[PDB]
Amino acid sequence: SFNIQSDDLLHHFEADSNDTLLSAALRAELVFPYECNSGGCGACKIELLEGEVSNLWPDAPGLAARELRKNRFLACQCKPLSDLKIKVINRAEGRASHPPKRFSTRVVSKRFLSDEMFELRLEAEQKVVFSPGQYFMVDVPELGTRAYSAANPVDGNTLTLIVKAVPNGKVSCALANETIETLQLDGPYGLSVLKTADETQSVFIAGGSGIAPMVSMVNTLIAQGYEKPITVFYGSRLEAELEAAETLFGWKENLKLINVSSSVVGNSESSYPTGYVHEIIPEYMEGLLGAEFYLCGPPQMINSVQKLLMIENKVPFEAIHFDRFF
Numbered sequence: 001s002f003n004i005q006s007d008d009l010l011h012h013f014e015a016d017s018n019d020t021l022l023s024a025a026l027r028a029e030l031v032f033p034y035e036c037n038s039g040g041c042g043a044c045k046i047e048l049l050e051g052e053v054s055n056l057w058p059d060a061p062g063l064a065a066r067e068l069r070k071n072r073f074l075a076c077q078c079k080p081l082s083d084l085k086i087k088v089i090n091r092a093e094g095r096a097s098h099p100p101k102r103f104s105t106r107v108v109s110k111r112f113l114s115d116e117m118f119e120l121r122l123e124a125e126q127k128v129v130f131s132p133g134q135y136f137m138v139d140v141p142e143l144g145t146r147a148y149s150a151a152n153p154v155d156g157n158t159l160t161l162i163v164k165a166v167p168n169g170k171v172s173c174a175l176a177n178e179t180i181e182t183l184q185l186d187g188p189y190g191l192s193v194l195k196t197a198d199e200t201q202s203v204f205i206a207g208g209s210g211i212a213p214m215v216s217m218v219n220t221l222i223a224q225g226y227e228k229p230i231t232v233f234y235g236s237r238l239e240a241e242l243e244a245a246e247t248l249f250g251w252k253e254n255l256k257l258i259n260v261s262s263s264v265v266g267n268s269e270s271s272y273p274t275g276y277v278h279e280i281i282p283e284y285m286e287g288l289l290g291a292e293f294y295l296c297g298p299p300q301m302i303n304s305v306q307k308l309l310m311i312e313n314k315v316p317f318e319a320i321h322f323d324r325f326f
């Protein structure tokens, strides 16, 4: 156990040799800036002042090469080799209600939603807790560990994942194609979560695997009797996934699913608006004044929709929740 000190933190904390600095801080009940826990966003960046560390992923894109030369690391990609003194670069913007914990699961079902998208249902030996919008780190031995979002409302010892098999992707393709009886998880993690307050309505915008946290959040709203409008914009190049989306969300009168197809040929025998979600949203924007927006999944879409909302319209930063998968 190594002692980790920082003037930027409320108190020092211990880190086990097997934890990253970010994981250890969160288990120590500290607020710590992060978003993705996956080396892409850069939010968890630290400067190493005293001590030695192991860099889990030198080529992590969340850090510029110049920053590495200036003794910076990503806390989510950094393990201590000694007691440390660190500087936390960014201001922390939120704290999760449930802290991350390691636990085992049994895979109780696998179901293909389309050629590339499938649903896993997992069972733990104790209740699986999270805030809808959060994710769990799923390890596949000898291949890697990746974040996957809860796709269910919180419910006993269960967890649902919705995974897209990424071409040449190590972990997602293994989850798709292998028969795996047990999975070791660590979570929940994540700060982009369902919130209900003074918003006029809720708007959920995703593409591909980004559907997963949307299903948890929307189905939670349905279960909890949310009465304000819920609008889901969902895009894919594969119309089989748009069709799958129709079955994934629960039903309620105030829920509208707007599937948008960028597919080359017309499939499914159900015509959708064509193009990309950032092309379709503008004709709804007048009616979405005051919404809470949740943006989930792929970079091209989150980038395009972010510009649409904050530049072309006047949606404040505070009304938008970013869940970037990188």
Ligand SMILES: Cc1cc2nc3c(=O)[nH]c(=O)nc-3n(C[C@H](O)[C@H](O)[C@H](O)COP(=O)(O)OP(=O)(O)OC[C@H]3O[C@@H](n4cnc5c(N)ncnc54)[C@H](O)[C@@H]3O)c2cc1C
Pocket (backbone or CB within 6 Å): 035, 036, 037, 038, 039, 056, 057, 135, 144, 145, 146, 147, 148, 149, 150, 162, 163, 164, 165, 166, 168, 169, 170, 171, 172, 173, 190, 209, 210, 212, 213, 323, 324, 325, 326
């Ligand atoms: C917050 C968050 C939530 C997510 N939720 C979902 C979800 O609900 N459903 C879903 O399908 N996907 C989700 N993803 C994406 C998912 O975590 C994987 O990135 C995706 O499944 C592809 O992983 P892969 O191993 O198959 O592909 P790979 O291309 O083999 O690896 C995926 C990414 O990890 C990079 N990488 C390479 N080496 C390492 C390393 N040592 N450590 C970490 N990363 C490395 C790769 O360069 C690549 O960019 C989420 C991602 C994030 C950050």
Ligand code: FES
Pocket (backbone or CB within 6 Å): 033, 034, 035, 036, 037, 038, 039, 040, 041, 042, 043, 044, 045, 062, 074, 075, 076, 077
């Ligand atoms: S939380 Fe570490 S790079 Fe995103």
Ligand code: NI
Pocket (backbone or CB within 6 Å): 012
């Ligand atoms: Ni102490």
Ligand code: NI
Pocket (backbone or CB within 6 Å): 011, 028, 029, 030
């Ligand atoms: Ni404390």
Ligand code: NI
Pocket (backbone or CB within 6 Å): 097, 098, 129, 130, 131
């Ligand atoms: Ni809770």
Ligand code: NI
Pocket (backbone or CB within 6 Å): 278, 279
């Ligand atoms: Ni455009």
